[PDB]
Nucleic acid binder design. Sequence first.
RNA 1: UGUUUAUAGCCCUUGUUGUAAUACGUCCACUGGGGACUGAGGACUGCGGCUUGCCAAGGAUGCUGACAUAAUGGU
Length: 42
Amino acid sequence: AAKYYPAYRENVPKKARKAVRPTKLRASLAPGTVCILLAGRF
RNA sequence: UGUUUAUAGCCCUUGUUGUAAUACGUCCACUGGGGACUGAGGACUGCGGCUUGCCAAGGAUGCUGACAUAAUGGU
């Protein structure tokens, strides 16, 4: 099959059960809101 | 000074509004937030929920950025 296999039987990680679910933003950050930038260049 | 709701009212008992409210106690296998520390394990098995796939259910993954530097780290 492949060429130059590693001399170590690879350790596959255990199947994680972390499912990505949609972020629930703050109830006060509706579109059209005026906001204040705290960090960054602005 | 003396009296008995009058041109203020109060105290006691009962009825009512009443299945009154609140406080306190207790409980919810009811629920909304904010912060902190930790991520041990390493294919598959298990117990469960959902609808075979999915799942927060036998231990962290995902999306990114900066720097790739003495920056982290050590002496």
